[PDB]
Every structure is written in C-alpha cells, then in structure tokens.
Homo-oligomer: A and B are copies of this chain.
Amino acid sequence: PSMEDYIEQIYMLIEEKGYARVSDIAEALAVHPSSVTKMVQKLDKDEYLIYEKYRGLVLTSKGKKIGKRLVYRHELLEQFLRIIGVDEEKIYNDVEGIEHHLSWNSIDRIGDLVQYFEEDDARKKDLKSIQKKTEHH
C-alpha cells in the first residue's frame, strides 16, 4: 500500500466511524500494525495528520482534502468500469490496482467520459450495441 492507500483508508474510517484506529487501518489494508505505525509517522511528518496526546489520529486540512480527493477518485473509477460493462465482481480489484497510477488529467477525462454516458442513456445503448458486434462478429 502506498501513502495514498493509507490516507484513502484513514479518511474512509473517519467518515464511517468518526475515528481511525491503527487496528482498523491494519485490517482494511491487510497489513501488520507495525507497517501502519511506520506510515502514520511519515504522514505525521509530512503534515497530513496529527495525534495530539489522547483523542486519536486526526487529519489536518491537507490530509482531509487529499482524502476526499482519493475517495472521489475511487468512486469515479468504479462508476467508469461499471458504465463500460465490466463484470461487477471484477471492478473493485481493478480500481484497487490502477487508481493511484493515473494522472489527474486522466482522472478528469474519465470523469468527462462518465458524464458523457450519464447525460444520455442512448449512448449507453449504442455502446452495448458495439459490444454485441465485437462479441461474435
């Protein structure tokens, strides 16, 4: 997991539970707690989050903005693969593997693509028609 992977999951946990426990981060990323503590320290140093005494892990404004961006990117990519017809079961793992290796330019263009299809269902129908061609013929 990259730094973006950690911030993405920390943001999600804070929104889901209201806080992000090291044990919960470790579970979400399927890694050892030590790996989390190491990354958390790096994120603290880079000012993405803090840990004032008790209370707990808290994202800084910089961490919150990036986290929101990452969840947006994840959601958008799933919608993209869903719209173009990828089997639902395969969508998550694919987004997991590509999301943090795409420039913002690509993300924003994929965003335009999604809007393109959402704007007129007729385009989705024509796309399905093409899938039928490339299917047999």
Contact = CB atoms under 8 A, between A and B. Distances in A.
Interface string A84-100: 11110010011001100
B98 A86 contact: no
A107 B113 CA distance: 16
A115 B130 contact: yes
Q: What interface size band does chain A fall in?
A: 20 to 34
A102 interface: yes
Copies in the complex: 2
A112 B98 contact: no
A8 to B, nearest CB: 16
A102 B109 contact: no
A123 interface: yes
Interface in A94-134: 94, 97-98, 101-103, 105-106, 108-113, 115-116, 119, 123, 126-127, 130-131, 133-134
B105 A86 contact: yes
Most buried by B among A101, A105, A116: A116
A66 interface: no
A104 to B, nearest CB: 9
A124 B77 CA distance: 21
A58 interface: no
- 4 smallest CB-CB distances across A and B, nearest first, come from A97-B101, A98-B98, A84-B109, A112-B131
